[PDB]
Amino acid sequence: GQLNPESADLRALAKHLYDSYIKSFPLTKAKARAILTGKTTDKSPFVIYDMNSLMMGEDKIKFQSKEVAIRIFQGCQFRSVEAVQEITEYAKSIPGFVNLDLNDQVTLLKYGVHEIIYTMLASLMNKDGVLISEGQGFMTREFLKSLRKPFGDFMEPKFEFAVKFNALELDDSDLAIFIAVIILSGDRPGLLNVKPIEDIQDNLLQALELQLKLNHPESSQLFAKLLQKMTDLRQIVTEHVQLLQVIKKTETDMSLHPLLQEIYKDLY
Amino acid sequence: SNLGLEDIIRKALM
Numbered sequence: 045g046q047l048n049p050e051s052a053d054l055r056a057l058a059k060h061l062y063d064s065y066i067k068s069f070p071l072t073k074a075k076a077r078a079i080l081t082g083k084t085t086d087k088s089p090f091v092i093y094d095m096n097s098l099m100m101g102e103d104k105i106k107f108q109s110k111e112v113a114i115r116i117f118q119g120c121q122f123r124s125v126e127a128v129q130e131i132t133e134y135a136k137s138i139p140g141f142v143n144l145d146l147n148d149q150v151t152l153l154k155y156g157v158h159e160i161i162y163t164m165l166a167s168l169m170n171k172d173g174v175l176i177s178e179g180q181g182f183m184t185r186e187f188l189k190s191l192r193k194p195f196g197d198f199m200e201p202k203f204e205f206a207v208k209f210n211a212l213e214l215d216d217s218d219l220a221i222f223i224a225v226i227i228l229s230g231d232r233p234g235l236l237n238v239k240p241i242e243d244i245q246d247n248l249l250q251a252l253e254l255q256l257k258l259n260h261p262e263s264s265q266l267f268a269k270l271l272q273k274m275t276d277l278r279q280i281v282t283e284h285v286q287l288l289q290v291i292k293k294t295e296t297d298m299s300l301h302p303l304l305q306e307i308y309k310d311l312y
Numbered sequence: 313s314n315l316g317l318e319d320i321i322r323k324a325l326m
């Protein structure tokens with residue numbers, strides 16, 4: 045590798061994406077990691093690890109279909125509108141994106157927002173649980189897993205991804221390019237002009253590859269390992285359709301504590 | 313839900 049004009053431009057693109065990333069996403073990985081590792085003295089979050097601590101934490105949890113799981117999905121998808129608008133605003137900063145066909149812009153985003161939301165949810169997760177209520181609470185992984193079916197199986201595949209994705213130790217500089225690569229995926233069904241999309245992603249992939257070489261000297265094949273994580277992201281999104289059919293076939297008890305219903309609406 | 317998201321995205325792109 046050499047520091048030539050082309051590498052200089054790729055560093056300028058990584059900086060441009062990072063600055064736009066910071067403007068668009070107020071909840072960065074660094075802020076989440078500071079809370080999870082206790083480095084922030086300003087927002088020590090409450091820990092919800094069982095039904096007893098859940099009812100003691102009624103203070104912090106701040107509060108239309110009939111099925112509980114459907115109402116959870118409707119609510120978290122409504123709560124996720126601000127994230128979708130932030131991802132869409134970030135996409136406008138990707139050089140060449142707004143020049144693409146408008147129908148392709150909508151198609152690229154409507155498939156991409158789900159995978160990006162899961163990527164940023166991993167920043168809120170460690171092996172023990174996930175942050176909720178804007179970092180004011182901490183919901184443990186095993187407590188979620190212990191809830192009655194089908195709710196007990198909702199989040200566990202996401203924790204398994206998050207543990208493997210966080211082991212790559214990406215920072216917000218890395219994530220800014222990775223998010224842009226996800227958006228410019230030429231394989232989305234219904235795309236009209238795949239060629240101009242891949243031309244942009246080719247540029248983003250070069251900028252990502254150089255960023256990872258500069259930022260992670262002790263990671264062999266980090267570029268490849270990170271691209272393989274997109275397979276795990278896609279499978280999680282795909283399995284949400286299957287999760288709907290599990291609900292329509294469960295005639296057992298589907299009632300959930302109202303505080304738990306509110307916590308799930310802050311997830312995805 | 314899907315066209316709802318497409319309309320959210322269309323409005324945000326304006």
Ligand SMILES: *c1ccc([N+](=O)[O-])cc1C(=O)Nc1ccc(C#N)nc1
Pocket residue numbers: 116117118120121158198199281284308309310311312
């Ligand atoms: C919302 C709240 C909680 C969960 N969960 O615990 O699994 C999921 C959701 C949700 O709406 N998830 C979701 C919606 C749409 C798509 C897509 N495409 N993937 C996932």
